[PDB]
């Protein structure tokens, strides 16, 4: 994959019985781990809920993989990969996502499907009281030939509280495991941020930085990473 | 709704990155709570996973509502209703469903969308080692003007074990709450059974009985139901 | 075990950093599945939380086992048994219990240890706005030589809503599994009720009825129980 | 609190009906965030399960708090603090902890109570197949005037696999709110390691390093921490 | 009045049937128009609504009166004054205030009574979605021998929108009319800001600056102020 | 509630900076909708304003509810209810009320708080030129689980003129919404009259009749009430 | 005026910048207070908002004037009259109307001008979610030689909720007040209903019944109307 | 838009049943915010009421927009814009306006429609006892993709009084959302003055200055505008 790529996104979903569609165009630097997307709600907008719950569904090939840790995603090209995830919110809401990622030339194409349910009508998401995500730390490890990820995230609320959730992901390379260098357990920091909202809450400029690493602040007494 | 109805079902989903579609034809006695469907996997079959996980997604308007408990579903007609649910398996798999139910004459039409993820490849579902569901007891109660349901189910496994899961559902009538007689807290027994599999594992004859009731084995010292 | 037995209970626990102890004396009809206990909060009372969360922790040897289903608990005497459980509330609270049951003469003696955490201070439990439990249906199945149980329960709230939780239990007979007739998958209905509260909310008269059974509302078309 | 302190620990617990007690003596540098403890299983040892599940229960006053982030724990002395936690394992096990932390002289004294249940008998924990924890990243945020923490951890298994769990903690200062400066949302890295096992599997030399910080790998484009 | 003063405040109110009391200690520079208050919700806190609605009720003797405009408030000492006001929110809520202001030595003492009603439960105030007030411009004019004020204010919401309201005030000097120089029509800019929230949302550090003036951005073609 | 009840009232308020208190003893026939109160101004009398503005603040449990329309107020006992209201006068005055209603045996107890402001000094109220209220028609409808009311009223002046006002009320039952039969849109006619004034304008014998009904003069062509 | 008349109406207006024109043909029985009009949107239809807001603008000479109450409108012929009104909706919308009424032979001719503004785009009116008006009660009283009217009305919504508004009207006879018998304070019930919609939502069959009266449900102790 | 423009205005209205028309020729400097118009009452003049109520209806494209605040009005050219407003007077009068603004070359063309009602006959407006407007401060904020404005104004009265009113405006650009940069919350000062009246009270020379800005007199302690 190139050091500079374009991004094209297509999303379709139903949350609490509300159908919607989104499309986005963006750019990013795969090896630097930085990127940005201009996401437009093409159908069903303005959404009856905070766009925040859609943010993390909109790019793991773009991450600075450090410490010699094998990059499961960049290794997957040209074949590409898909990933699936369920996000469990502390107030009972569930959001499941199926995504396909393809690399056509220097353009990353994302096709996303989402199904969300049980979001409380008077909760922060449905009441649009949330104000973006705190950065997070994803735990990555292999299992049964695929790469798994788990993360705890926190939505900022106007009152100062946070609404937390748990992401459980399975990343699936289109390359056979035999053709891949599987990575050891490691982490990936992510910082998604919406820097601008326009067109009556239907257009969002979203930026994100990601870095894969080992625990660097606490030294091992046993020579482990 | 009449005493005898026809059932037409359309389903589309992706589980562990495997896309599939199903269509069914059936019948049922709404007030007797008995029904049967002939479900055909029209695309993506035979499925690489046990059809058992799709079974509970294929009819709550057909239930013998006893003890004078108001029937939230039959009351929603002719407008109909929709429901959303996430099923959490004990081995980490999640399956989210979005469904729409409408009544055309004396025919119930179901449109279903499913997204499933994280099913362990060596688990009983992906290995097709499950052998049907044990009967179950659903807990139903109102909240925020809609009807909620929660159930623990158990899939019989060939090794003698049971694989358990937790269903969390929100049923949404298309009629305004004020035009409905909301039910008190109650239960609903369900007994889905596959009696025949044919056409190279793509046609499933599925029967089911459902009965809404109160606890009927434990007396109350306070006269409560 | 006899047709009528006495009950002596000792409980110690800490919930949200509040330490407390309870003692109770009661009676029951093991085969009839009916019982009553006069539970006194001996230390740390009045509790800063609803007594309702302790109710389900205060007697499975007392249950009417029907349909020829082997009784794992009564079979365990005179040796007795222990059980361990964690209850997960929908608003983030957890309550773990460890219990020992023995039969001394004609008296069932219960020794209970409880640790609870993360109960929301503005929640119905910590605000004492709950009004007893709704009857429930426990799912029972064997696994690895022991008997397991899972149940969803709902706490009635003052505002009319229900607070739901999930119980995950493991019952351990003190007799070697070898000397026991392990039961098939089955259910158990429970109806715990507090009929009187006195001594400034430190004494509770609690009654309960339990019945072990199979699904008796939905006939099986495959000849299964 | 002194920059050099000793540690004294007392633990009692029951896991899968196995009762045990532990005691430890150690030392640490509160502001450097480094520490070591010699933990002896004084009763019920050698344990019938991996000591790994006990490891994370044995010291948050010892953490290097960087970036001027208010230190909830060090601000709590001399009054001290307590914390409560439930750890949920992916294979159904639950472990709940209640802890009290006091400073006697220049020695941190820990009193721990543990209740564990539903650990699978043939699982890696009960089979003693785990090989310590991977380092972890805890999410810390305020709620209801106290400090909350949530973490995802992973046990290393022989197969090269990992067994994951989720920690949900509430830290409770015994100091007046008026005398405490609460921290903003932040993280704390922890790396607990058993560097030596002796005395026939009953003595564990455990080291740990902890660092509280903001996300430093991913720059904010909104000027946030 | 001194160039520097202390502030002491006592408030009692009921909003949407929720009773509360507040007390505050602060300081200000009467002639510079700047001040600060540390407001504690002594009873009924944390409030079930945004503290923002209470902010503007908490100091008109502290304002920089420019352009030779007579200062109705400072002229009122030592007698002091009272003021009454009703704030009408665009979504149907009303909040009425009665206030007494006295000068005790170097301390301005405020006694406030508040009654609020009809705030929508899912509105920004009851949902705590607001994030402070935008600065505002008060219109001041004499009528029936007293000073009247009217102002349009706007609360900032998490979503980027604003919730507006209308303040209608009557200021009543306790000084004999014959001893007061009544001011001509003029404006007063106000900028209340909460710079810190602590003690579980019950302690607010609030600052404010106020300036009385004529319209200086648009010249008069008739020589009027 | 009984067919014949006693009434005890306690009132405290401040209008245009004039503090006052009232107390009353009365009787009524709840189902007949008739009642009387002997209201005494216990502090601040004679009032510097017409007692007419206090009249409508002095009993909604007493109303003849016709046509099978559910009675929100009588249904609220024994718990009782509260109500809040703001009355907006055409000449700029505002009067806000908070009231609590309890039933003790057959005695209705009212506790009222009032804050009024901006009444013009030369208007009919402050000049005590009003001569009672014309009967009025209240509009009642539910919203967000509570009962709302709105009414336009008119004070009579000797010259044949009227001074109008707008009442905006929220009635809040102390019973759970689930335990109440909510009424459809309807009206309530009210006719308050002061039949005797004594003790130098500090004791008022006030009578009132109230009837809840649908529109009975204009038949519906669509079969609506 | 005769007991059976024809009705002809011409209307032009702009609401939220949408221009439209309407024309109607109908009939009414002046003394019976009943009438019906076939209202056609001749320009700008189908309207981008609910026709419901236009309904009350389409006949006060048609009202059953009971109880000997002087009929300001009937007395105005042959000269006729005009009326002006502003309707204030609770969600911030305003609609102002200017109307002229003349009698040509036995045909009442109405010429209407309307300007509406600030209707929320997502409100029930602009979204066409309203379902007609509930009947209402107008307060009528004289002032400065003319007749005034004020009414609160409520639009019905599907949820069972209502959108309320306030009408403030001034009726102006073309006859000199000297030649008219002015009425005392009284009421007028109105019940507008759309019984048929056709021609792609541009033709509305609307009927209405009106009755002028005094309060007839609450007898007066003092002897007032 | 040019730095120097001409103005052409056409107005038609009906206030308290009095029909009138006006036309004007003017000029202004859009970026400097200064302008003048020579307004002639072409029909229905001299008006039976104060021309002051028409003054604010006669130019928002002419305003000095400072501090980098996006200019909604100038951005709207060449397409143009419209605006709608209702002005509510404290003595019960309402005046609604609909306006269209076009830029033909360097000439701004205004087409204005007005409907006013309920002005008291003995009030200052109808008696022509007003002496021009005091300058004012408009609050501007976006909502639903359009620009809203609200302002309180004060008309100079006879005996040294002021008659106040509230303006509620919606400004509608003819450009699409994608082609506009929406402004943050801000203010606009306005100072309309009649400097000459001639031709028997039918020709008015009116000047005005407007400035859009943030609050500059009161510093923010949080770095907000």
Automatic annotation (TrEMBL), chains A, B, C, D, E, F, G, H:
Transmembrane segments: none
Record keywords: Chromophore, Luminescence, Photoprotein
InterPro entries tied to this protein: GFP, GFP-related
A family per Pfam: GFP
Entry's Gene Ontology BP terms: bioluminescence
Annotated family: Belongs to the GFP family.
Protein's recorded name: Chromo protein
Natural source organism: Epiactis japonica (Sea anemone)
């Amino acid at each position: 994959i190139s050091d500079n790529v374009r991004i094209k996104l297509y999303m379709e979903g139903t949350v609490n019985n509300h159908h919607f569609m989104c499309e986005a165009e963006g750019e990013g630097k795969p090896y630097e781990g930085t990127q940005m997307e201009n996401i437009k709600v093409t159908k069903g907008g303005p959404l009856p809920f905070s766009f925040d719950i859609l943010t993390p569904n909109c790019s793991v090939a773009i991450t600075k993989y450090t410490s010699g840790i094998p990059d499961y995603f960049k290794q997957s090209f040209p074949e590409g990969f898909t990933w699936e995830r369920t996000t469990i919110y502390e107030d009972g809401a569930y959001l499941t996502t199926q995504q396909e990622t393809k690399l056509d030339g220097n353009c990353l194409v994302y096709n996303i499907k989402i199904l969300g349910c049980n979001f409380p009508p008077n909760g922060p998401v449905m009441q649009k009281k949330t104000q973006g995500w705190e950065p997070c730390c994803e735990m990555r490890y292999t299992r049964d030939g695929v790469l798994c990820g788990q993360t705890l995230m926190a939505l900022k609320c106007a009152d100062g509280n946070h609404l937390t959730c748990h992401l459980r992901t399975t990343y699936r390379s289109k390359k056979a495991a035999k053709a891949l260098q599987m990575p050891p357990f490691h982490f990936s920091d992510h910082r998604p941020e919406i820097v601008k909202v326009s067109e009556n809450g239907t257009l969002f400029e979203q930026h994100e930085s990601s870095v894969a690493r080992y625990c660097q602040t606490c030294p091992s007494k046993l020579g482990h990473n």
